[PDB]
Amino acid sequence: GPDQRAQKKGDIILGGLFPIHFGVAAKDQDLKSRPESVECIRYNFRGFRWLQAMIFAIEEINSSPALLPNLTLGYRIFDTCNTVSKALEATLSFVAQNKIDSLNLDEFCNPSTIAVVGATGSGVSTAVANLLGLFYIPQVSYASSSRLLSNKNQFKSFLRTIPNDEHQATAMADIIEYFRWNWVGTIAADDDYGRPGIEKFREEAEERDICIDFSELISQYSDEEEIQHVVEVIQNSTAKVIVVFSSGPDLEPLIKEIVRRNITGKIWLASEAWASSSLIAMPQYFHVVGGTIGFALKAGQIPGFREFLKKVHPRKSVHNGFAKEFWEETFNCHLQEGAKGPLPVDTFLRGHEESGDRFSQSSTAFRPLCTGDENINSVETPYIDYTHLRISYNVYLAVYSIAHALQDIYTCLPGRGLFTNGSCADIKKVEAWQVLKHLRHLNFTNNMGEQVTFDECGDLVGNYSIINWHLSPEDGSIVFKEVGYYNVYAKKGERLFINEEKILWSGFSREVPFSNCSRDCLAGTRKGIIEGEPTCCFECVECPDGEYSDETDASACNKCPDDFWSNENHTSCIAKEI
Amino acid sequence: GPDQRAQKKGDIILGGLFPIHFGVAAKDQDLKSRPESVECIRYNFRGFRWLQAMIFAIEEINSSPALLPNLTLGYRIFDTCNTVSKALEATLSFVAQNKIDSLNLDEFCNPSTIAVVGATGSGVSTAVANLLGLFYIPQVSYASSSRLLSNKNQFKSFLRTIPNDEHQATAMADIIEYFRWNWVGTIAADDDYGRPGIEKFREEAEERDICIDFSELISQYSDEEEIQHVVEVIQNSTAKVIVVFSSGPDLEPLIKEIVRRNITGKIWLASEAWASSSLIAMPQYFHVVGGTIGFALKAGQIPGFREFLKKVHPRKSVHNGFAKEFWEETFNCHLQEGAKGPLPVDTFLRGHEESGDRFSQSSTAFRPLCTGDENINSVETPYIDYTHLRISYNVYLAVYSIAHALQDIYTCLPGRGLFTNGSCADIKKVEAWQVLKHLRHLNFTNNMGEQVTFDECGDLVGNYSIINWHLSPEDGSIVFKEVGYYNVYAKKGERLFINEEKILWSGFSREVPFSNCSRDCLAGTRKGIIEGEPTCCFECVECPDGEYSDETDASACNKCPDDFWSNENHTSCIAKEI
Ligand SMILES: *[C@@H]1O[C@H](CO)[C@@H](O)[C@H](O)[C@H]1NC(C)=O
Ligand SMILES: *[C@@H]1O[C@H](CO)[C@@H](O)[C@H](O)[C@H]1NC(C)=O
Ligand SMILES: *[C@@H]1O[C@H](CO)[C@@H](O)[C@H](O)[C@H]1NC(C)=O
Ligand SMILES: *[C@@H]1O[C@H](CO)[C@@H](O)[C@H](O)[C@H]1NC(C)=O
Ligand SMILES: *[C@@H]1O[C@H](CO)[C@@H](O)[C@H](O)[C@H]1NC(C)=O
Ligand SMILES: *[C@@H]1O[C@H](CO)[C@@H](O)[C@H](O)[C@H]1NC(C)=O
Ligand SMILES: *[C@@H]1O[C@H](CO)[C@@H](O)[C@H](O)[C@H]1NC(C)=O
Ligand SMILES: *[C@@H]1O[C@H](CO)[C@@H](O)[C@H](O)[C@H]1NC(C)=O
Ligand SMILES: *[C@@H]1O[C@H](CO)[C@@H](O)[C@H](O)[C@H]1NC(C)=O
Ligand SMILES: *[C@@H]1O[C@H](CO)[C@@H](O)[C@H](O)[C@H]1NC(C)=O
Ligand SMILES: *[C@@H]1O[C@H](CO)[C@@H](O)[C@H](O)[C@H]1NC(C)=O
Ligand SMILES: *[C@@H]1O[C@H](CO)[C@@H](O)[C@H](O)[C@H]1NC(C)=O
Ligand SMILES: *[C@@H]1O[C@H](CO)[C@@H](O)[C@H](O)[C@H]1NC(C)=O
Ligand SMILES: *[C@@H]1O[C@H](CO)[C@@H](O)[C@H](O)[C@H]1NC(C)=O
Ligand SMILES: [Ca+2]
Ligand SMILES: [Ca+2]
């Protein structure tokens, strides 16, 4: 398929899809001549690291004698540029051999892909899944978390090492329940993410008897006026706990304004989409957004990866086409055409110093020089300058899923096969649909000792890492301290586990905040219903003359003995002086 | 003047001019509206280092109690962008106060610059000098080496810590003389550099009895045909020694072709313009260009400079306007608007990962993020990745020239002043023309222990460092090993001093090559003139019958005694058997 790729031979081929670029250029095709392939514009260092996580896991699988012995895992990895078009150009190459000809007569004419890792965006994954589904080629996504992809009617071969965004709303309710709060506020992104998330939360909240004071919608494109309203809505409210179902871009305008007005009290309940978002996790914002409790993807650990990442070289990395471009973008240089060794960067450019130079002639020619001798462990790029592996880990975990599903094919005995009936699959003549069947019944142990099995819908039955926003003493930046986990496999109530001692409320407090509508009614008063306000909002109605309320949180005052009467402050009855 | 600059207050102001950019953008001004200032395009890390050499020397002058005590040296440094226009915008600001008003009535209306450091290109310096000359403001250039600037009729206030390109041609002849060679070839750039250089060399060569076999002209814009001819001209010639008066760009096409044809023998005599040129000093080329002997600017040593260079910060460097742009270009990031601390580079860009993203909207917005916490000692840029200080040293040496000329003003006693007669100059009321007078009579000792005094024409009476092209064993690149010096102050013959032991001919030979037209005539033969060929091309004519040649290099054969006759091989006469 596409010219630029990361390809290596093997007995079984694995397809990769990664956003090495954030998008494609806005070229208006003249159509005056045969249109040429659009060019990808913003370099993604993180995306290239995700691509390396696939290669590394394959190389680790091939080195390990235990896993897939007498087999070589081969790969064909392309750049999606976060666009459906580029991602489909790649998918067509994966799909090409498999059944395209099987449907058509072209078989009379003339490298089968059995599984595909990817993609990042839920939009891109949907487009890829529509094509891979026709031939039942399994697709294991590392970052697409939209609830729409769970539909096994539409997506026949879709799987993901990332959990569905639905469970997050039920999880939020479980935390409100745990810290015994009944007065909350909701903020949502005015999109297919925030809206159903807050709606699902609203359903779960009313079930656990949690009342919502306010429900507001936000966007990245909201007016100064639209933001001013929500800010007032939060300020006017007595609820400290706010549940936010937004992304970093959509929530950023509102947060900027709350940081502008220095509104400290609020204790944030972060949605996965912004819980680890560095757009919000900014040190200038800690006054407001400090001590935020959120959901993250488990920060996995891949040993020897940092070393393998450092091993990249444009000449030495023969199976990585993107290695030259990476080198070129990480140093901002037009790499030397021919040979080593070290030479200054100016080399060509110093030609501009000449008094016989250009008038827009050599400016388009003379570019910074790369020898290939530069050290990458030096430069500050998201490639090596990273704190946690979450997506890189899901790319890792994605490859292993396919390897273990293939190992299950290799392992089964002729009477214990899944296929009709007891029939095992030939690993030499292995088909994509067979790997899909094995991936559905897959149960394997992670390289971190965690059980990795898939749901009916193809989602990873996995944990959400409960993280807390602390400020580093040494560093001076926001730190995501893991204070718990959310197991979606466990039964209702047994799904959540948090270590309160590890939490720092608002970023400094060590005592769990109060976020109930009305403070508990004392002795001398009873609970009174407030008209208009919800069930959890009560009035502390003083006991009538001749009645007393013994304990706190009393529904009604008790009448006193015929001979006795209420004391002055209605705590208990006293004897009538006769 | 211009908005962006490096400015600091002081008792006396020094003007700086540096190419922080290689040029300006090719904008065709619509003229449909008031044209806006053209933008500078290619970032020059080396140029910014040269700018730092000025600041560092000023800061070192201010810290040292010996030099200019009770005075603060102030500066106003601008970016020339290697263009006359940008360099003139700056110069106008320097010139502004001084006499512009003095000529005109505007004095009735409302920071004097006494000396200017710069510029790089001979073209730019000429344009600056034409303006500074009207007000006699001294200009000390660090890189402009054109012979045209020596004209004190045109350039009244021009000086330079770089020597004039003229002496180089006489120096070349002195080397040919030293290694006792008479058969050479010449190659020149078809411009105002190569042409007069080779012509001046041709004059000096004929004086020391050096014959030139071929004289060819080259360009960076020469045809494949034009280069093929010169290559043949060199190949067909018997001369090993070739004298090249070219720049790296102009000589590069010819060198590429000589490297293509693997012509090893040739021993190159490099002109300053290409002697240290990394465009030619490439390891792939060593087969041809190995052991090149050339002229360099003395590789000076500035202690504590590397430390000061590392001290740069966009926030912390308050007097350096270019510090933010440097930071931005050395990391390729749009620096954070407000505050610290460390944050990932993606931050904004990771917003492209969202499924509700742009169509050429956020692509123009989302840019890589800089915290200001990044380490510069890491990144491979010509700013810190440098081997020798030649131009940076001339910028250093330029500032010191002005400081010592000012110290001479401060030091003189009321009867020993240069001015009419014995009159000293008031340092509190110091004028630019007074500093110029002191710079002309300047004699001071360098921070390396070298005498720094200026010629009548304003050139630095300084050495040319004789360097040799060796290949590094550890590194694997071209090394410029200093094998001598060329003192232009010394008298004819006593100007040159080279250490033959330090030289490696062709890059490996330890024996001085043969580059004479004809090999010395032996015993039995005499020297015979070849018609058409020059004086140094001789024929070894065998002695006639009855004549003998006793020793080697004989002008004619001697007749034998009347009784005796020539021996068979004419070495000496033998007795006639009677
Ligand atoms: C808030 O209300 C809940 C109701 O379930 C209760 O458990 C909690 O203790 C209340 N908070 C206080 C401080 O009384
Ligand atoms: C409270 O909210 C209303 C709208 O819901 C708004 O008009 C008002 O300004 C807010 N704040 C105060 C101080 O009343
Ligand atoms: C919050 O905002 C005000 C605005 O004037 C500012 O002065 C104050 O320093 C801020 N609070 C803190 C603790 O930064
Ligand atoms: C294979 O097993 C399935 C599941 O029990 C059943 O539907 C099918 O009829 C069996 N086939 C045979 C050959 O018995
Ligand atoms: C297999 O899957 C079942 C059901 O999810 C689970 O109980 C079991 O622990 C998994 N692993 C093993 C080793 O049985
Ligand atoms: C979640 O945590 C439990 C307990 O540590 C573990 O068994 C499970 O496998 C983890 N989930 C994932 C995604 O591996
Ligand atoms: C009731 O009144 C007495 C006497 O003033 C006082 O000491 C007590 O605190 C009051 N309240 C309660 C809750 O007993
Ligand atoms: C080359 O000619 C010069 C003439 O001055 C002479 O000194 C030198 O020795 C000659 N070379 C040889 C090898 O004879
Ligand atoms: C020598 O030079 C002439 C032109 O000067 C050229 O025609 C010829 O090809 C060159 N080489 C040989 C091998 O004669
Ligand atoms: C010079 O050129 C030839 C061209 O075929 C090449 O094979 C040879 O290796 C070169 N010489 C050296 C020593 O590199
Ligand atoms: C000052 O000295 C110069 C040089 O000797 C001379 O031309 C000039 O006339 C002298 N002036 C006086 C006042 O004697
Ligand atoms: C001053 O200049 C003269 C002439 O160039 C020179 O001989 C002398 O050494 C210089 N320095 C001193 C300290 O006299
Ligand atoms: C040249 O070298 C001599 C001897 O080391 C020294 O006196 C002279 O000052 C040097 N030239 C320069 C440019 O300083
Ligand atoms: C002269 O001839 C003799 C006898 O053949 C020989 O030994 C000698 O080398 C010849 N040449 C010279 C330079 O003497
Ligand atoms: Ca993707
Ligand atoms: Ca300049």
Author numbering:
A (entry chain A), B (entry chain A): 21 to 130, 136 to 603
Q: How did the manuscript describe this experimental structure?
A:
Form I crystal structure of CaSR ECD represents the inactive configuration since the VFT modules of both protomers are in the open conformation associated with the resting state (open-open), and the interdomain cleft is empty. In addition, each protomer structure contains one Ca2+ ion and three SO42- ions. The inactive structure of CaSR ECD shows that subunit association in the resting state is primarily mediated by the LB1 domains. The inactive structure revealed electron density at site 2 that is consistent with a bound Ca2+ ion. The inactive and active structures share a common Ca2+-binding mode at site 2, suggesting that the bound Ca2+ is an integral part of the CaSR structure. In the inactive structure, electron densities revealed that anions were bound at sites 1–3. The anion at site 1 is coordinated by the guanidine group of R62 and backbone nitrogen of Y63. Binding of anions at these sites prevent favorable interactions across the interdomain cleft that promote VFT closure.
CaSR is a class C G-protein-coupled receptor (GPCR). Ligand binding to CaSR takes place within a large extracellular Venus Flytrap (VFT) module that consists of two domains (LB1 and LB2). In addition, CaSR contains a cysteine-rich (CR) domain that connects the VFT module to the transmembrane region.
